Design an enzyme around this catalytic site. Structure first.
Site, short mmCIF file in Angstrom:
data_model
loop_
_atom_site.label_atom_id
_atom_site.label_comp_id
_atom_site.label_asym_id
_atom_site.label_seq_id
_atom_site.Cartn_x
_atom_site.Cartn_y
_atom_site.Cartn_z
N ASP A 10 0.84 -0.96 0.05
CA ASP A 10 0.13 0.34 0.23
C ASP A 10 1.03 1.46 -0.20
O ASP A 10 2.02 1.21 0.19
CB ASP A 10 -1.10 0.24 1.28
CG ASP A 10 -1.72 1.31 1.45
OD1 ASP A 10 -2.66 1.13 0.31
OD2 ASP A 10 -1.70 2.20 2.27
N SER A 11 0.21 2.27 -0.54
CA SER A 11 0.91 3.70 0.07
C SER A 11 1.73 3.99 1.57
O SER A 11 2.41 5.33 1.07
CB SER A 11 0.44 5.24 -1.20
OG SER A 11 -0.96 5.12 -0.49
N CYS A 73 -3.81 -0.87 -2.11
CA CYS A 73 -3.56 0.60 -2.81
C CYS A 73 -4.92 0.57 -3.98
O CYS A 73 -3.87 -0.35 -4.71
CB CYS A 73 -2.70 1.23 -2.57
SG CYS A 73 -2.46 2.88 -2.80
N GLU A 152 -6.78 10.44 7.35
CA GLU A 152 -5.19 10.36 8.60
C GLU A 152 -5.51 11.60 9.16
O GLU A 152 -4.65 11.63 10.51
CB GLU A 152 -4.54 10.28 7.72
CG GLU A 152 -3.89 9.26 6.98
CD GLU A 152 -3.27 9.09 5.93
OE1 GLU A 152 -2.06 9.18 6.53
OE2 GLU A 152 -3.09 8.19 5.06
N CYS A 184 -11.48 3.43 -2.56
CA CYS A 184 -9.72 4.17 -1.20
C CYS A 184 -9.76 3.44 -0.53
O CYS A 184 -10.41 2.88 0.36
CB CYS A 184 -9.77 5.74 -1.50
SG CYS A 184 -8.37 6.64 -0.50
N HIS A 186 -8.84 4.40 1.95
CA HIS A 186 -9.52 4.92 3.83
C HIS A 186 -10.67 5.35 4.10
O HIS A 186 -11.52 5.41 4.90
CB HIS A 186 -8.71 6.83 3.58
CG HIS A 186 -7.34 6.85 3.67
ND1 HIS A 186 -6.17 6.29 2.56
CD2 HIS A 186 -6.39 7.22 4.85
CE1 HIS A 186 -5.06 6.60 3.15
NE2 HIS A 186 -4.74 7.18 4.16
#
Ligand code: DGL
Ligand code: DGL
Ligand code: K
Ligand code: K
Lengths: 266, 265
Positions: A10-11, A73, A152, A184, A186
């Site tokens: 993942d990023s 991701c 985040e 996404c 998140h």
């Protein structure tokens, strides 16, 4: 394969939503996760750059006995999934196709929305994946660039989160959809806000939940499921280790094993 | 331009629930379905007998260009899935594992119930499949022998259906579950009655819905999805053709192509 692990890349920290679902639905598998926090976000980056970073993470994961690779991701999957599936001999599962597949399962009207980073949306991979399975679907794809950062860095500011979710989803409130793919890593953390904004008539699809069941399906089809009754997982990050550990404990509800890594390897 | 089809076998008409889900979620694929209505039900039959009948259906389907085989009948899958997967070179997708997998995805408490025919439940394949993925799940498996016949022959008698669903689910109302797998082709037709009996705290899983997405996942993983924008499907039955056509029209809401077949070929 009895000691082989599932590689997850993942990023950054977002991919923990995917990792948590693999841990929940495939409790006998062992996770080896790498998050490239030092270069997060990937959303606004060029495709060429993202592909190079993803291949650097794959080189790191190859040091472990991988039975499969999960590109957790959505941005990374949009940019390099095809390249990875061609390059590697092990199964490579991205987070985009499982979400599209689940959307087809739950839609009643054949009208699907999907939100994600600019890179994910500009790739048009969601529309392409959906149409590969059913040409007669209407897909509305909308980039929501402020959402991952909101998750985040501003999640405790509920008034701000509500305003940002309202602004991001305004274009979709104008469209006729009955299904929305959270494209996404998140977005699952914003699920409540999103549901409030779109209403009861829109079914929310989590990339994480669907990717874990897709992985489960493929591992069993291939006859390579683990039988470990108490596996352990390892997490690696290119950014601050203390930073990753702190967010992880907040998201997961418990502490995890986190180590630092430098890319490119060696 | 790939002309291969998805073979689907079932003990009779029940498998139309699985066929409808494949048609809906994989609209570019072509279905070739065989229902052994002349020997339905399979639920009360011996495992050896069911295995024999299923292999006769596979011999019939092999006359067509199969890219994959779906065992739409939970009773048939319980008795022969392993044998079929070992004998055939094409992917064989049964209806049991997809249901177990979906149950793991939706359960919050790890307490799953499943209902089906005596044959399905006695095989204990659901508990085995669930535990293969997660050993720490509690599975409550109960046979509901009267429900498939109720669905085929008494569905319009709502008072009777309600009473039969109440009696069949009594043992599960006593158990702590938060997920219920409908481990029989006919049960989707009773979903409302079942939801009313168990309450909103139990998520009901359809074998048909989950098997179609499992098939989709595997066909795409193997790179063999069809690209046909308007396929046609064919249905075959060992029983009365007019009878099959009538039930099918009632369940699907439209008429389908049905032809008679004799087994063994
Ligand atoms: N993990 C990214 C969100 C963060 C980023 O832009 O790198 C994604 O799922 O698209
Ligand atoms: N198709 C069967 C129900 C009917 C029968 O007993 O053959 C099953 O899904 O278990
Ligand atoms: K580093
Ligand atoms: K009676």
């Amino acid at each position: 394969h009895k000691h082989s692990v599932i590689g997850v890349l993942d990023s950054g920290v977002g991919g923990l939503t995917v990792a948590s679902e693999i841990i929940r639905q495939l409790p006998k598998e062992s996770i080896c996760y790498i998050g490239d926090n030092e270069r997060c976000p990937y959303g606004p980056r060029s495709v060429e750059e993202v592909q190079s970073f993803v291949f650097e993470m794959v080189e790191f994961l190859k040091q472990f006995p991988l039975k499969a690779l999960v590109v957790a991701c959505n941005t990374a999957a949009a940019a390099t999934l095809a390249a990875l599936q061609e390059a590697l001999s092990i199964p490579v599962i991205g987070v985009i196709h499982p979400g599209a597949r689940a959307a087809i399962k739950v839609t009643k009207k054949g009208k699907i929305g999907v939100i994600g980073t600019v890179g994910t949306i500009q790739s048009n991979m969601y529309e392409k994946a959906l149409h590969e399975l059913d040409t007669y679907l209407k897909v509305h794809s909308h980039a929501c660039p402020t959402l991952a950062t909101v998750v985040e860095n501003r999640l405790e500011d509920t008034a701000y989160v509500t305003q940002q979710v309202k602004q991001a989803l305004l274009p979709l409130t104008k469209e006729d959809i009955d299904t929305l793919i959270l494209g996404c890593t998140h977005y699952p953390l914003l699920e409540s806000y999103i549901k409030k904004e779109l209403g009861e008539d829109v079914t929310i699809i989590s990339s994480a939940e669907e990717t874990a069941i897709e992985l489960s399906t493929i591992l069993q089809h291939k006859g390579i499921l683990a039988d470990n009754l108490n596996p352990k997982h390892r997490f690696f990050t290119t950014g601050s280790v203390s930073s990753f550990e702190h967010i992880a404990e907040r998201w997961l509800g418990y502490q995890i094993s986190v180590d630092c890594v430098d890319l490119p390897v060696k």
